[PDB]
Amino acid sequence: DDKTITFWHNASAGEGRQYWENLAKSFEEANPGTKVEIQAIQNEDFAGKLQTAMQDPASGPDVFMSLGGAKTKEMIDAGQVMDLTDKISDTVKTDMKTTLSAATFDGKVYGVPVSVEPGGMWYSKDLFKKAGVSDVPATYEELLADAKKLKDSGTDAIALGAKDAWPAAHWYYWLVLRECSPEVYDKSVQDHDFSNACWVNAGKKLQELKDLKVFNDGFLTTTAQQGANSSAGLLANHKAAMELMGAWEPGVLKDLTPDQKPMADLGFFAFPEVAGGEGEPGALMGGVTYFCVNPKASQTSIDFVNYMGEKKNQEDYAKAFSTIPASEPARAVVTDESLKQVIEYLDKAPSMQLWMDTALGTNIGNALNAAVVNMLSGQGSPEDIVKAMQDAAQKG
Numbered sequence: 001d002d003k004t005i006t007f008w009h010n011a012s013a014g015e016g017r018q019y020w021e022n023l024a025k026s027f028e029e030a031n032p033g034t035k036v037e038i039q040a041i042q043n044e045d046f047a048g049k050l051q052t053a054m055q056d057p058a059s060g061p062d063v064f065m066s067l068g069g070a071k072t073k074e075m076i077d078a079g080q081v082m083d084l085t086d087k088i089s090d091t092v093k094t095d096m097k098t099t100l101s102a103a104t105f106d107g108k109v110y111g112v113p114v115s116v117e118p119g120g121m122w123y124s125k126d127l128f129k130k131a132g133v134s135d136v137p138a139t140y141e142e143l144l145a146d147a148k149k150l151k152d153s154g155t156d157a158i159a160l161g162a163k164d165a166w167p168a169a170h171w172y173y174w175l176v177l178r179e180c181s182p183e184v185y186d187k188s189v190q191d192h193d194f195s196n197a198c199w200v201n202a203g204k205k206l207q208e209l210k211d212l213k214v215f216n217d218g219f220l221t222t223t224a225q226q227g228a229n230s231s232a233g234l235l236a237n238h239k240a241a242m243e244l245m246g247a248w249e250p251g252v253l254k255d256l257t258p259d260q261k262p263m264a265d266l267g268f269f270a271f272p273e274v275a276g277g278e279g280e281p282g283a284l285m286g287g288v289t290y291f292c293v294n295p296k297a298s299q300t301s302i303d304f305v306n307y308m309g310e311k312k313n314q315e316d317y318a319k320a321f322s323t324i325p326a327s328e329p330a331r332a333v334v335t336d337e338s339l340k341q342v343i344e345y346l347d348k349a350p351s352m353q354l355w356m357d358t359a360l361g362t363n364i365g366n367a368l369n370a371a372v373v374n375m376l377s378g379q380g381s382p383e384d385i386v387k388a389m390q391d392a393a394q395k396g
């Protein structure tokens with residue numbers, strides 16, 4: 001049928017999963033005859049399922065979460081994502097002014113944003129006091145020192161979901177962004193040129209952290225967002241003192257604490273400055289979640305994504321996901337102190353880089369994440385991380 005639309009998101013459980021049920025329901029009420037069939041897919045499975053399904057756009061989902069950056073671009077150039085420039089509502093155009101750029105390719109708009117999620121450090125303020133850290137580290141070396149203190153207090157300083165590859169890679173990404181100059185960074189990413197010394201230097205800085213042995217012991221088998229022993233789970237239950245992550249973090253943590261209530265002592269702090277690096281200080285990096293429409297889809301799918309962008313639904317999104325909504329007016333309803341700081345950093349950044357693996361695409365992103373994990377497991381070098389990107393870059 002025609003007024004029936006398949007819809008894929010990655011809110012696996014909890015309020016987030018329920019939020020989408022609720023949205024579908026009240027969408028169905030406002031557009032009679034329409035039925036929304038939902039698939040809630042866990043994040044690490046999502047790319048695979050989306051790309052298998054979209055080989056046949058006719059038999060794929062009508063509305064789906066985007067993979068972001070070059071990965072969205074890869075779908076556009078395959079004709080798996082419909083052009084929404086002349087279709088997004090005026091409410092979206094007005095309210096998602098700053099966030100729509102993440103969804104814009106070749107001047108054309110390809111999705112509706114629901115959230116913006118910068119990265120940084122999320123930490124236990126309680127575990128920090130117990131170890132003797134009264135102030136958050138403004139530099140990398142201070143951070144590595146704070147990890148030593150935290151280890152001595154007999155807690156795992158850093159939770160790391162290395163089994164999922166990307167969470168470990170985020171350390172690398174952040175180091176490269178601080179080490180490389182904005183122009184070398186911007187050119188490297190866009191040209192797939194990884195020859196500059198800032199790319200090896202960053203890995204060296206990451207190997208330093210590795211040598212400190214300050215991760216949770218099972219980091220190699222630790223996932224990011226699955227279970228109590230996932231890296232968010234370790235942070236949520238005060239088994240580790242900090243994690244490097246996107247601003248989806250409070251909502252994730254909230255679903256992994258004993259009472260499924262927000263992490264009482266949660267704090268945020270920007271990824272520190274790095275001595276000798278030439279990156280624009282306080283450079284932001286992060287994500288923008290948005291929803292794409294199947295090129296082979298009907299008007300009902302268009303009205304659905306526009307529905308997402310309406311202020312009330314975005315405010316509800318913010319509460320359900322404990323995140324920053326895309327809609328600037330809906331950001332009013334944000335109360336979490338850590339998320340407040342993140343908005344402060346957001347409202348004064350000159351730019352935000354997308355996640356590096358997202359920016360570089362599937363081949364280069366995957367080869368990069370694996371390589372970083374390999375070095376961390378003592379089967380790779382900072383030089384090998386570079387090698388790997390270069391080798392995969394050959395394919396395009």
Ligand SMILES: O[C@@H]1[C@@H](O)[C@H](O[C@@H]2CO[C@@H](O[C@@H]3CO[C@@H](O[C@@H]4CO[C@@H](O)[C@H](O)[C@H]4O)[C@H](O)[C@H]3O)[C@H](O)[C@H]2O)OC[C@H]1O
Pocket residue numbers: 010011012013014015016017043166225246248250251252254255287289320321322355356357358
């Ligand atoms: O390649 C890397 C990416 O994969 C990565 O993807 C992001 C990772 O995490 C995703 O966050 C989602 C968001 O919501 C969670 O569910 C809700 C959380 O809050 C609760 O209130 C609620 O009840 C839940 O439904 C979810 O579990 C989690 O997976 C995110 O959307 C992705 O964009 O980013 C970086 C790349 O390097």
